[PDB]
Symmetry: D2
Amino acid sequence: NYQPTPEDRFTFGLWTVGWQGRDPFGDATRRALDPVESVRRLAELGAHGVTFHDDDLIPFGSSDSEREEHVKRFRQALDDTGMKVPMATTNLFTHPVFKDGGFTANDRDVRRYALRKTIRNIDLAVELGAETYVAWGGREGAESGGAKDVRDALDRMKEAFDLLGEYVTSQGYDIRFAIEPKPNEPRGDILLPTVGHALAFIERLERPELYGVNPEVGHEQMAGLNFPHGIAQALWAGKLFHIDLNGQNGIKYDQDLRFGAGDLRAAFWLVDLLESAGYSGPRHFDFKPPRTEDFDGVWASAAGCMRNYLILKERAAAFRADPEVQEALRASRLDELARPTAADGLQALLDDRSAFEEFDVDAAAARGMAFERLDQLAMDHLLGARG
Amino acid sequence: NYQPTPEDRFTFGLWTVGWQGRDPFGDATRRALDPVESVRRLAELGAHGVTFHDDDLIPFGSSDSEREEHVKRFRQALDDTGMKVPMATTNLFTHPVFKDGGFTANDRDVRRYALRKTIRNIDLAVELGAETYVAWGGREGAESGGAKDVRDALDRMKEAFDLLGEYVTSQGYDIRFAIEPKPNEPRGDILLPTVGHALAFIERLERPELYGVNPEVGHEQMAGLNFPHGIAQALWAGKLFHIDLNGQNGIKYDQDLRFGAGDLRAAFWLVDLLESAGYSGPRHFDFKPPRTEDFDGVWASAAGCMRNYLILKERAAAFRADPEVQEALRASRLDELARPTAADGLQALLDDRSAFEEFDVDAAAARGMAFERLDQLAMDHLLGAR
Amino acid sequence: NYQPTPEDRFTFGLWTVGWQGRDPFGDATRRALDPVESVRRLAELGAHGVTFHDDDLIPFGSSDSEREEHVKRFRQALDDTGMKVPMATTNLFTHPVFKDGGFTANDRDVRRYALRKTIRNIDLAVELGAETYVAWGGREGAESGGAKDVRDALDRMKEAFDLLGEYVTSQGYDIRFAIEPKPNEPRGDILLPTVGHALAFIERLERPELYGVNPEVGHEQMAGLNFPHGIAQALWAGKLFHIDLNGQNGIKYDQDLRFGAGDLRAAFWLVDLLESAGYSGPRHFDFKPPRTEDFDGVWASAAGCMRNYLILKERAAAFRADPEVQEALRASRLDELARPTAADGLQALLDDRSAFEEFDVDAAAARGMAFERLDQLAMDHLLGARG
Amino acid sequence: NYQPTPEDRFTFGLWTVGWQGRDPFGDATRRALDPVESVRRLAELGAHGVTFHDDDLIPFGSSDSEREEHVKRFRQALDDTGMKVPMATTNLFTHPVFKDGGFTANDRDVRRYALRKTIRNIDLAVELGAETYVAWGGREGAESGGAKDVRDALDRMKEAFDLLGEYVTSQGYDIRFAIEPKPNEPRGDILLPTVGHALAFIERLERPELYGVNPEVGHEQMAGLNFPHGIAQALWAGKLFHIDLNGQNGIKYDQDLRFGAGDLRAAFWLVDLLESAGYSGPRHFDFKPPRTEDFDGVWASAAGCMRNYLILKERAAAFRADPEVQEALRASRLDELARPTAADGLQALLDDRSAFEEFDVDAAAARGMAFERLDQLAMDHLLGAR
Ligand SMILES: [Ca+2]
Ligand SMILES: [Ca+2]
Ligand SMILES: [Ca+2]
Ligand SMILES: [Ca+2]
Ligand SMILES: [Mg+2]
Ligand SMILES: [Mg+2]
Ligand SMILES: [Mg+2]
Ligand SMILES: [Mg+2]
Ligand SMILES: [Mg+2]
Ligand SMILES: [Mg+2]
Ligand code: NA
Ligand code: NA
Ligand code: NA
Ligand code: NA
């Protein structure tokens, strides 16, 4: 019955199940969770591991002895359960000091602090076994046009990520970075607002091989973009280092619904792509159990994340295995799309009368794509309504 | 005043003033314009030049003789007026053959044809003096998830742009390519949907230096993005080869309103950035006079594009030249943003207790950014209410 | 296997399957369909009936003898098949004369023409058995702020709909009107942009009982609204006279995908609501087979509209019948929502200490809503992944 | 100039200037403001009055004695300055008890409490002189489809508003209610999501004359709607009891920027309409100074709200007073829109061959609307570029 097990690689942030329910218009509806409790409960649900922001695990402003106690307890829970920590990240957004950014704050002293805060937590992430270190620059941006010279901000952004790369290289760490885009919220506009912008920026870093993306379902959907398509571009670039899975209903505030909620067909096509491409990284959920829920509802929502992935995995696999689908894909020329356009080379293409003077454009135009029949097979598979 | 002159480098597509007004739900409201009349009237309005899709200038399916006559007439009008042709592009979207794409059509024979159609028009563009060749892949994408394997499509897209680069290199042409993003419409989702996606894709081409972006105001706004921010990233990357200027009211179909319409404050900040950065390319308008209008309204709308650029240019310049604004920029630490974060280097940063152990976070957090005063000065300048 | 039959009340516009594929950036990809052919093909698919704009059935500008031939042929096909015509409408958007509107064109002569064109087709609709006459004011609106005084436009809009009501009353017709909202496209902003605006406007008409709404899935979704919620408000007002079913992916141009495409979960909740509320009107599809398709794909797409409704109907019925769901609904207090708040009356409420000084707000706040468990039962039912 | 004076009727919520800056992802950046300080500072800035939620003025859970002292201090500051309180409202959204709603909570005991909390504050509002009592049902709605039966919720909503109407009638109060729509946030979808939905709902209440709308600029824009159009429909219905003025950049979270920010041209057309229609209610700002700002930036941002209204008022008045604009309005047949379509009556229309049989559709279609010239005059006026 779609029961997750550790090899399914499902992970959760401490801040997900641990979200107390404060929003822009409301106070907390749930008590804080002890990270130890979350590790044990997630393990019992069949999770593979957890992730954290520095300040989720160690309260901001902790002394070194307080810090070591929080880390010791957490490590004992990880030890006891075999839960992994594949990813961690820095909170560069909550504290008021980051109101204008971390790495791109106009105040230089804040930018330096942001880097030091990040470096401290890289060391901890590495100790705990993380392979990826995520950066969500939620405060990088502006509400007004004069407040932020974006070229200079990108210079600062590059400087910061280059220093982090120099740091991990100097320590011999194999951890890689994953930049997480978001278009807006909490800033009016956030820098590097989409997968594409982040991918482009990475190509201007000194050591681009150390950086990839951590796309989040809902974030690309906040710009009305097709999440599967963006994932395909990330995979095509070799840069899908990690992913955040959740749900979102279109263009509005960041909802962080459980995975499978929001745009269900997009979730189907995402799972189909990840499985077809052989994505091997964590299936990480960055979600918030709605503040209507009590803790039983927290754990139900978490369990639903994993369940929906597994159901969708089964349906996508059935779709791709169905001989009727395989024939529909041929009818729609998906196989021709995989063939090089002109492996014969430029001069042969220029000399090919079949490609121009003798190309019967009308006959080609008349050939239907058969995409609706293919899509209704896909629908039937998703809904368990075959044959 | 605000009267354009050719040195302002304002350009217009033939398809802009020449839009006959057919929409999803409506027939044409205006007759077709002869390209020669558009060249002459835009010259009279103070334009610098014009641009075209192949099929705007030479009707699809024209014989060689027909083609020659269309081109000859056009060149006579250009030569008579001194109008330039800084950019051209291919129509890979109107003909039914392109219903699933040009470069990324599932049908391989269509992909080959798309390349041949493009190459024919690159040759013409070069003869006319174009510096940039635009590509808007408006039919590249899908309405359904199974229809288009996006990784394979990106392989096909790369192969196409690489062949075009090979072609121009083989002919010794100086022309460069500019990819124009759009997120959707006419496809349910279009590949390379934003400036970012196009910039990223370019870095995987074999000769990336030959390709840049042609961002369009309204297209980025159809994804709710900040167009000035995206232009800043394109400038930062050295890839703002060309631009399309127009207006758009948020997230909906592509409106192509005259420049200045739609998001007026975004237009202000865009002009401020282009002028500040020294963008030297064409100020090209890709707009549609609304189908409500007759030809007099066509030419009014075109004149409005240029007028609005010029008004905004004045206001942005006055903003930047105002000592009170310069004071406010300092108060908001725009100057500190330009200083390197850690020119002292990594080790020095690590050893700096003022950056962590002894950093007074509370004192830093208490410092207001003064962004609202700065923005109200910007508003006052925009509105001529100083 | 989810095969539609006439009592399922599925209807289609002539302009749906007959869409030739012209868009803003492209020429037609399919030949025109003879209305006779469409009637016969839709009948063979299990449709209940068809609908039309005047100009779909009789080419604009037809002489009276040409008109009668087109109508005669159509009537013979309806006769032969038993297909019904439950609804018709006017094309007040295609011809250039309507570039600034029909009923709210600034030019008075155009407004009068629009009314005459509409009245002529009301008579035909009535003859053919229509119960509803739809009005989509696609050209009513503006691209710029000075072009349209909206108060005066609403005066004109009211005048027009009042005249139509006076007309149908004068002829003793039992046909009712259904206003179809859309927020934008082809105008920059369209008047009466949502279900709510249309419902409100109707209350200012002289004979409000003669008018309701014809909401379309995709149109409310073009404003990012929840279509099921808007339908619930229409039903609550007694004004769901007709509906247009299709699919849409969020905030963008009007896609008119086949029903079930676009927002699949919204389609589920819509069907659940229509069936639970006992909506008895036509299940009408206003969709466009994508221009990628040939005619085989046209008919496949049409068939998919009906199939998806039927699958969703089955899943919603299973959801509501499941005792586990019935208990989850009780756990979430859906039953309490159905109870009057204060049937004891205002004074009793004011005197009830349990409602204020003695109300334990903390204990109430602590009670989780259990909405995630309920929603995951709903997901499991939609996907055929129970128990 | 553009200096506000009390006669301009500018008002502000205590929660606006008093917003401490907590957002989804961030802690407060400013200390709490004492309501008395806000009254005095807004008076000094030229405001007419202030508004409040119950819990802005009297901390939730305050004892009777505490409550009396908070109210006494506030009234002394009002009386000292002559500031008015034209509107008040209830906080039915912050406390966890309201997590599924107030009036439409699934839990009946919560619904009853919500009503009692509202009624207590209506009494206070009346004592302070409020003419309008706002209701923003920000927690009424759902994140999932099964959670909320919307027809039953609308029954509960109607029952609540009817009880409130019964209450005010029973006490002989003159106060009227204004429902404030919002489409989403904090709920995934909020009930009564737009002006239209609220206007429709009001017509099903037992005493519809007692209820109107309190539209907010940014809320309608979160659905991509045209705010001036929605205000025109509210005015047409006789239901614009109050308004919330602010700025928003399109479809995203509720920004609550200062008025004039966001969609500047929409702000222009809004002011033009309010002034033209003779709206006589408060010009109320529901805005948040960005959390980047310190208190000096709070007061700058508040001053900016009023300044921008005044600049736009000037420019809209100059537009309407310009004989060239009046000419253009005639050219675009705005005057013909005001004439009845068929005052001759139905039969005359039916018998009029000039309306159908002999109507020259082509000649009519050829007549340009001249809307672009009109809009460029409007742009020129807005920008002070005539
Ligand atoms: Ca998120
Ligand atoms: Ca465009
Ligand atoms: Ca539609
Ligand atoms: Ca707001
Ligand atoms: Mg995330
Ligand atoms: Mg493959
Ligand atoms: Mg363009
Ligand atoms: Mg429709
Ligand atoms: Mg019921
Ligand atoms: Mg408000
Ligand atoms: Na939420
Ligand atoms: Na051609
Ligand atoms: Na489409
Ligand atoms: Na209180």
